């Protein structure tokens, strides 16, 4: 299991709302194309953040993760998630949620 | 055998991570050009420090060794390694790792 | 080659005389019983210290080496020399000479 921490950013980049959800270490929830048609972790995470942060649009936001440099990188692909977890050594995945 | 101690330096030149690896007294691991195409000790050391210090880039760092004066000298050549070991009398080779 | 540093101690354990000699990394100078009849490094070292420190008796002194604890251990056997060198990492062997 891996708890993912999300940080909501308003206009002054100030923490509006905080919420976390339990995630599986598994690559993807489903295997069939009826349930995985390419993505998996990204589409899963972006789903929870939507229901968790109703303050903004359901799918009208980008999640930005810090890199080795610290800069924000708006991720939106499973390939980018596998990389983002490579940074964190612990079982906590922090990310910066922003509404488009 | 010769244990090499590496010191990771952040922004405040503070010891981020410490890790050591066992090295051979031998000049080079391999002799064939398929395995030694000029370098040997430098390329070997820089390889371990990368896998040992994943906190930064794999090959985007410079290792600086103290001299007779004490100043840091970013080494990156086998010829420089043979010299660096000439300073230390013991079987412990200390070096200052910094990410570019 | 291995330079051995000796420290002469009077009555107040104060450094009377200082002198060094070049030694070989080899186990023993000779192999024949006419030249090695058991000892080798101890008998060799104790020989030089005598000629080097004429201030006292030729063979009426004990050489004490620091241990892992720091305490002095009057050595007088080849088996004890091989161990004493195991402490020093460098190519310098320090010892405390005392006349009996």
From Swiss-Prot, chains A, B, C:
Triggers of expression: By proteasomal inhibitor PSI and prostaglandin J2 (PGJ2) (at protein level). By phorbol 12-myristate 13-acetate (PMA). Expression is directly activated by NFE2L2/NRF2; creating a positive feedback loop.
Q: In which tissues is it expressed?
A: Ubiquitously expressed.
Residue location of crosslink Glycyl lysine isopeptide (Lys-Gly) (interchain with G-Cter in ubiquitin): 89
Q: From the Swiss-Prot or TrEMBL record, state where the protein is found.
A: Cytoplasmic vesicle, Autophagosome; Preautophagosomal structure; Cytoplasm, Cytosol; Nucleus, PML body
Q: Give me the ranges of the annotated region Interaction with PRKCZ and dimerization.
A: 41-100
Outcome recorded upon mutating residue 65 to A: No effect on interaction with PRKCZ
**PB1 domain segment(s):** 1-100
Q: How is it modified after translation?
A: Ubiquitination by UBE2D2 and UBE2D3 increases its ability to bind polyubiquitin chains by destabilizing the UBA dimer interface. Deubiquitination by USP15 releases target vesicles for fast transport into the cell periphery. Deacetylated by HDAC6.
Q: Where is this region: Interaction with PAWR?
A: 48-78
Enumerate the residue ranges of region (Interaction with LCK).
Answer: 1-48
Annotated positions of the Phosphoserine modification: 22
Instruction: Quote the function comment for this protein.
Output: Molecular adapter required for selective macroautophagy (aggrephagy) by acting as a bridge between polyubiquitinated proteins and autophagosomes. Promotes the recruitment of ubiquitinated cargo proteins to autophagosomes via multiple domains that bridge proteins and organelles in different steps. SQSTM1 first mediates the assembly and removal of ubiquitinated proteins by undergoing liquid-liquid phase separation upon binding to ubiquitinated proteins via its UBA domain, leading to the formation of insoluble cytoplasmic inclusions, known as p62 bodies.
Q: How does it assemble?
A: Homooligomer or heterooligomer; may form homotypic arrays. Dimerization interferes with ubiquitin binding. Component of a ternary complex with PAWR and PRKCZ. Forms a complex with JUB/Ajuba, PRKCZ and TRAF6. Identified in a complex with TRAF6 and CYLD. Identified in a heterotrimeric complex with ubiquitin and ZFAND5, where ZFAND5 and SQSTM1 both interact with the same ubiquitin molecule.
| Record remark on domains | The UBA domain binds specifically 'Lys-63'-linked polyubiquitin chains of polyubiquitinated substrates. Mediates the interaction with TRIM55. Both the UBA and PB1 domains are necessary and sufficient for the localization into the ubiquitin-containing inclusion bodies.
The illness linked here is: Paget disease of bone 3: A disorder of bone remodeling characterized by increased bone turnover affecting one or more sites throughout the skeleton, primarily the axial skeleton. Osteoclastic overactivity followed by compensatory osteoblastic activity leads to a structurally disorganized mosaic of bone (woven bone), which is mechanically weaker, larger, less compact, more vascular, and more susceptible to fracture than normal adult lamellar bone.
Name this polypeptide is given: Sequestosome-1
Organism of derivation: Homo sapiens (Human)
């Amino acid at each position: 299991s891996l708890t993912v921490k999300a940080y909501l950013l308003g206009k002054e980049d100030a923490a509006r709302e905080i919420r976390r959800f339990s995630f599986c270490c598994s690559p993807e929830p489903e295997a069939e194309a009826e349930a995985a048609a390419g993505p998996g972790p990204c589409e899963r995470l972006l789903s929870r953040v939507a229901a968790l942060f109703p303050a903004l649009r359901p799918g009208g936001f980008q999640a930005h993760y810090r890199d080795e440099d610290g800069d924000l990188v708006a991720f939106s692909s499973d390939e980018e998630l596998t990389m983002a977890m490579s940074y964190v050594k612990d079982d906590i995945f922090r990310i910066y949620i922003k509404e488009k």
